[PDB]
Each structure stands twice: as structure tokens, then as C-alpha cells.
Design an enzyme around this catalytic site. Structure first.
Site, PDB file in Angstrom:
ATOM      1  N   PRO A   3       0.793  -1.226   0.000  1.00 50.50           N
ATOM      2  CA  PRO A   3       0.000   0.000   0.000  1.00 50.50           C
ATOM      3  C   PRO A   3       0.827   1.279   0.000  1.00 50.50           C
ATOM      4  O   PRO A   3       1.637   1.481   0.903  1.00 50.50           O
ATOM      5  CB  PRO A   3      -0.747  -0.060   1.328  1.00 50.50           C
ATOM      6  CG  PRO A   3      -0.651  -1.478   1.759  1.00 50.50           C
ATOM      7  CD  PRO A   3       0.705  -1.924   1.280  1.00 50.50           C
ATOM      8  N   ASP A  27       5.543   3.408   1.865  1.00 51.47           N
ATOM      9  CA  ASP A  27       4.712   2.317   2.346  1.00 51.47           C
ATOM     10  C   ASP A  27       3.962   2.746   3.595  1.00 51.47           C
ATOM     11  O   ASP A  27       4.579   3.099   4.595  1.00 51.47           O
ATOM     12  CB  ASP A  27       5.579   1.109   2.672  1.00 51.47           C
ATOM     13  CG  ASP A  27       4.830  -0.127   3.112  1.00 51.47           C
ATOM     14  OD1 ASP A  27       3.588  -0.061   3.221  1.00 51.47           O
ATOM     15  OD2 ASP A  27       5.496  -1.156   3.322  1.00 51.47           O
ATOM     16  N   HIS A  28       2.628   2.671   3.543  1.00 51.01           N
ATOM     17  CA  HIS A  28       1.770   3.357   4.488  1.00 51.01           C
ATOM     18  C   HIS A  28       1.514   2.505   5.721  1.00 51.01           C
ATOM     19  O   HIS A  28       0.861   2.960   6.653  1.00 51.01           O
ATOM     20  CB  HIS A  28       0.444   3.716   3.826  1.00 51.01           C
ATOM     21  CG  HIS A  28      -0.204   4.928   4.387  1.00 51.01           C
ATOM     22  ND1 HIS A  28      -0.382   5.138   5.729  1.00 51.01           N
ATOM     23  CD2 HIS A  28      -0.707   5.990   3.785  1.00 51.01           C
ATOM     24  CE1 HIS A  28      -0.976   6.305   5.908  1.00 51.01           C
ATOM     25  NE2 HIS A  28      -1.180   6.836   4.739  1.00 51.01           N
ATOM     26  N   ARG A  29       2.031   1.279   5.739  1.00 51.06           N
ATOM     27  CA  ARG A  29       1.943   0.427   6.903  1.00 51.06           C
ATOM     28  C   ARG A  29       2.973   0.826   7.955  1.00 51.06           C
ATOM     29  O   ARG A  29       2.803   0.487   9.118  1.00 51.06           O
ATOM     30  CB  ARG A  29       2.162  -1.024   6.488  1.00 51.06           C
ATOM     31  CG  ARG A  29       1.115  -1.556   5.532  1.00 51.06           C
ATOM     32  CD  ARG A  29       1.367  -2.970   5.080  1.00 51.06           C
ATOM     33  NE  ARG A  29       2.485  -3.036   4.167  1.00 51.06           N
ATOM     34  CZ  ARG A  29       2.802  -4.093   3.445  1.00 51.06           C
ATOM     35  NH1 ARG A  29       2.032  -5.159   3.459  1.00 51.06           N
ATOM     36  NH2 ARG A  29       3.884  -4.079   2.695  1.00 51.06           N
TER      37      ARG A  29
END
Lengths: 422, 247
Positions: free
Chosen positions: A24, A214-216
Site C-alpha cells: 500500500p 509504504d503506508h503500513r
């Protein structure tokens, strides 16, 4: 026409792009002034030319700024993985910076690979430039090992070479962010205007920088703060002092400021005051000492008269034209050309004091001869200077060898006295 | 240095971002004049100062404009779900607006949460401002319930606070669109010019607004028309009469 299987390096590129569908991602975009980069890069390349060095590029400077920014915001170096079936954050030991090198192959098809500069967080600009040029050099000669393609933690790409304004790229597995650098050019609404008119307004050039993350493991606020830091560094006093120190350039860097109005004392008056300051006090910053030595207990004179800020001028005046009253045998000139001539005459290997003389004809004679410069010598003349230097040094060494203890008061260190007297 | 499991609110953020990979998304970008906002905001804050009131912000104004635009284009409030194994469109009863509040925690790590202002389509500017300040106030005192984090239909984010020009954000499951507000500043080719010279030319300031939407239920034309309406409202006579009347 038709179908054909994918084979080779191309098959590997295809498989990795398919794997990347499970990350993501989000993107941030920011535009930054680029005028001070142009100015200060020119100053560094002038120093290298006289010392028969190379040439630095915009990617070198932005690369170094990016490293400093990652140090200020360490979260941008982290990544994500699932280990033993649990979610995990990975914090590496080093900042390894990946460069996107576009290299043609033997076949005749271009392929993109990412090579790494390793252990970057313990480097200064000199060290950084060397490592960069090492990777590039070995790539062209075809001498890269398998270790050079492993351990990348953060990547840099440059779509602005062709002239793209910005991009939204893909992130590969094992990293947390990728940074993209766009075109350094006027906006397209100004691409048909005249130079004269742009100079009057005070219009500069841009650079647009992107961040894909990366949005995690990285949030939006962190990404924004990262780009804000990069923007500040490229217009910062302390940043350009580091680079100048490391490349051994003797001048103060050009500073960042707003354009000022032509009110009160006119700007032609200010350019004439600058000419007078260099003729009078330029010897205070001239390159006359063979050692890089300042004696600890001696007072250092003020030399604020030699920077353009004290005379209310700015980087925005460098391409404007002024009346100079016969300086350089011309009635009109740009501030760039004025500074160039003054520095060549009064700040290199000869420093001169002559403005205290009362007679006008004496002053004019000296001024004319110092601003014309030293004429280029012939080859016979050059060989004669080498013979005299050799004689001096050789004589000293002979006496040292044959009579060791005996007192002679040597001239070693000052052998140029012999060609001066001659 | 090394590996460490993700625990807590951070684990929840990670899981939701993984779920969001099953939404097809597209984005639209538009830039808008911002001079009239600056002027009219100053006039409202002068009135409040004499009456010992507070102060309104740019997010308040853009928030209210966004609500009016969603009323004009209702498709932007819909969402998608599979129910009994069939594709389904979901049309809610109310417009509940989610605010991205960045709040530090006891530990010393920042976390982002989305709280809701509910039943917004039956509010005037005075009512809207009160509800906004209510959510913000209770967040700082630590008095938000579990009901405040449920039922969001459309979200607003503000990356322009730090100074980002624009962004392309992620959409979370259960919604149809997310709106982003970028920097309100001169373009970077004018950041070294003099005030005198800019005043002579007639150069103004910008704001860039984005729209990220689910393409199974919203089409591109609708998204474009939404942004066109927002652009018109922020420079419209009737819009600023409402705000002035209410304050």
C-alpha cells in the site's frame, strides 16, 4: 507482430513488478526554488577547473541533501515484513542509497538496474562524491559484482533528465520510500518570454521532488516533514559552508535573500562602491599563503566590505546591466562580469596595495597594469624558470649530504627567491 | 537496529491499509484562486475581536464549502459492498464528515485518527463552526467516545499545513471519496521576488485540491464537476453573504 515469451533480465523485471502489488503506497509532491543551486554549483566548478579537477552535477548535490534529511528523520529508512506469521518493523544498521543507472547492453536494449552506495551516514561531501563516481565508473567498464546489488534501503530516481515535470513511481519490496527528481526549468507559461523581462520581474527556476512510501510503516506527516527539511537545506547557509569547505574553495558562498527595490541610493552607485572596495581592500582575502594556516593569537581584520550584501545587492542582480564608467574598457557591464574581473585581478596569487598613493598618474599606471593581468610566457621562458628552481634545490641537497652537522642556513621552503632576483 | 513486532493502534493501522488494497481508485487535481478567502477571513476576524469572540481558520471555510458541494452532487457520498454475494450500492441517510486529527499520545508517538461531525446537511455556518470546535476541544481533554469514530461517509485531510503542494492519498473501506487540501502559498518561481513587483503585476496565491474516489461507483465526470463547484463557491457572492449573515 504477434506473441513472444519474455526471457532474461526482462522476465525478472516483470516478476518483481507483480510482487510489488502487495504494498500500500501514497505520494507527496513539493516544489522548491533552484536559483542558489545554479549559482553555488558554478562557483565550485570554477575552482575545479583551475585545479584540473572534474565537475559536479545536480544529482550529486540533491543526493547529499537527501542523506542529511534521512538522518534528521530516521523513520524514512524503515521497512515491513511478515516473519513467523507476525507483522514486523525492520530498522537497518546503515543508510545504503540506490542509484537508478540506465545502461545499454551488448544486445542493444536498455535495462535499468539499481546499484548501492553503502554506509553513507558516515561520509562528508568529498567522500560521497568519490563513492558515487566509483559506482558509475565500474558500471561502464562492466566490473560490478553481485554484492553491489544487495542491501538497498532507500532509492533515488531522476526522470527530469528527459524533461518530465514529475512522476508517480512504483516501490519495490524491501524498502520504505523512493524519491523522484523532476525537471529544472522555467514553467511552461514563461517559456516564450524574453530574458530582459524575466530579469526585471525576478522569476527563478523550480525543481519538483516526490516521495512514495509504504503506508503500513510511514505516515503522511513524516513524509511531509522530510520534504520540508530538503527544501530548507538547499537554501541554507550552513549546508553550503560544508560543501565549500570540503572542495577547498576560498570564497564565501552566495546567500539566499529577497529582491530589493531600486529606491534611495541607486544601484549604479552601489556597483561603483563595490569596485572601489576590491581595489582598496581585496588583498585581505587573496590566495597568497602556501599553507592553510592561521596564526592563533593574531587579530583578524574585518572584511565585510567585499560581500555583495553589505552594498545592498542580491543574487537577483547578477544578470542585470549597469554603468561602470570605463571599467574594463567598457561603458556597460553585468554584475556577474564585474565580479569575475575583480576577483581575477585582486584575489588570486598576487595581492596589491596602491590606493593610498596621492598622485593620480602613479595610481593609474599601476591600476592599468594590474587589471590587464600577467601575460602568458613562452616555452623557452618556462624551461628557464625550471632550470633555476632545480639549481636552488639541488645545491641545498648536495650540502646536506656531504656535510651533515655543519651550519648553512638553508633556503628550503623559499626557493622562488632565485628566479625573483634573476 | 533489528526487528520488532507491531503492537497496538499501529497494528490496526497496518491491517486496514492491507484491506484497502481491494479498492480501485483514481484521482483528480485542480488549482483555485485564494485571494478573496484571505480578504473576507480578515473581515470576519475583525468583527470577532471587538466582540471578544475567537478566530476562524481556512479549514473551517473549505470544510463548509465541501459540504455544500456534496449536497449539489450527491453521488460523491455513496459507497460499495458485496452483500449476500451480490454487488451493491449504498446510499446513506446523512453526510458525516471525518476530520484527520493528529494527536500525540502518552508514550510520545504521533497517531492519526478520524473523528466525525454528524448530520452536517442540516447546518448553517454558525452551527458548523460549533460542532467542529466541539470535536477538537474534547480530543485535547481526552473525552471522545466510541460513537464518535463510527459512521463516516466522507473525509478531509490537510497536508498543506506543513507546506506540501499536493498529495495522492489512500481510501479506506466504507467510503467513496477523500478530499485533500494543499499549500496556500506563492508558486516557487515567485518566492524570491519583491512585494512591490508582485503587486504591480497582480499575482495572487493558490490552493490545490484533490479528489480520490472509488471507480466502481463514482465516475470521472462526477469528480470533476464536484471540484468545479467548490471552485465557484469560494469566489461567489451568495456564499460569502451566508457566512457574513451568520457571524
Amino acid at each position: 507482430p504477434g506473441q513472444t515469451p519474455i526471457r532474461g533480465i526482462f522476465k525478472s523485471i516483470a516478476k518483481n513488478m507483480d510482487i510489488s502489488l502487495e504494498i500500500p503506497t501514497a505520494t507527496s509532491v513539493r516544489d522548491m526554488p533552484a536559483r542558489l543551486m545554479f549559482e553555488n554549483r558554478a562557483m565550485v566548478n570554477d575552482q575545479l577547473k583551475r585545479t584540473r579537477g572534474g565537475k559536479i552535477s545536480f544529482t550529486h548535490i540533491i543526493g547529499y541533501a537527501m542523506v542529511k534529511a534521512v538522518m534528521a528523520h530516521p523513520d524514512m529508512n524503515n521497512s515491513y515484513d511478515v516473519i513467523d506469521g507476525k507483522p514486523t518493523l525492520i530498522v537497518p544498521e546503515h543508510i545504503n542509497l540506490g542509484l537508478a543507472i540506465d545502461l545499454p547492453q551488448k544486445d542493444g536494449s536498455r535495462a535499468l538496474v539499481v546499484a548501492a552506495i553503502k554506509e553513507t551516514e558516515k561520509m562528508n561531501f568529498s567522500e560521497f562524491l568519490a563513492a558515487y563516481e566509483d559506482i558509475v565508473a565500474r558500471s561502464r567498464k562492466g566490473k560490478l559484482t553481485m554484492d553491489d546489488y544487495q542491501g538497498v534501503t532507500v532509492s533515488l530516481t531522476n526522470p527530469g533528465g528527459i524533461g518530465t515535470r514529475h512522476s508517480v513511481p512504483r516501490l519495490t519490496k524491501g524498502q520504505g520510500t523512493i524519491i523522484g527528481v523532476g525537471s529544472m526549468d522555467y514553467p511552461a507559461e514563461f517559456q516564450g518570454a524574453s530574458e530582459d523581462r524575466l530579469a526585471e520581474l525576478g522569476v527563478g527556476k523550480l525543481v519538483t521532488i516526490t516521495s512514495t512510501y509504504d503506508h503500513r510503516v510511514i505516515q503522511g506527516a513524516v513524509s511531509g516533514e522530510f520534504l520540508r527539511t530538503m527544501s530548507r537545506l538547499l537554501t541554507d547557509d550552513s549546508f553550503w559552508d560544508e560543501i565549500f569547505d570540503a572542495m577547498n574553495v576560498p570564497y564565501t558562498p552566495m546567500r539566499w535573500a529577497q529582491d530589493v527595490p531600486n529606491t534611495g541610493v541607486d544601484k549604479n552607485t552601489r556597483v561603483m562602491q563595490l569596485i572601489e572596495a576590491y581595489r582598496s581592500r581585496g588583498h585581505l582575502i587573496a590566495d597568497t599563503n602556501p599553507l592553510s594556516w592561521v596564526q592563533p593569537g593574531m587579530p583578524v581584520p574585518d572584511h565585510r566590505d567585499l560581500d555583495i550584501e553589505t552594498h545592498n545587492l542580491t543574487i537577483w542582480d547578477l544578470d542585470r546591466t549597469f554603468n561602470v564608467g570605463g571599467f574594463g574598457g567598457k561603458e556597460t557591464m553585468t554584475l556577474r562580469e564585474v565580479l569575475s574581473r575583480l576577483r581575477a585581478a585582486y584575489t588570486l596569487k598576487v595581492g596589491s596595495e596602491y590606493t593610498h598613493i596621492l598622485d593620480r598618474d602613479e595610481r593609474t599606471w599601476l591600476q592599468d597594469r594590474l587589471e590587464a593581468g600577467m601575460p602568458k610566457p613562452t616555452q623557452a621562458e618556462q624551461k628557464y624558470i625550471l632550470q633555476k628552481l632545480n639549481a636552488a634545490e639541488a645545491f641545498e641537497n648536495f650540502l646536506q649530504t656531504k656535510y651533515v652537522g655543519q651550519k648553512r642556513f638553508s633556503l628550503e621552503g623559499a626557493e622562488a627567491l632565485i628566479p625573483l632576483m634573476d
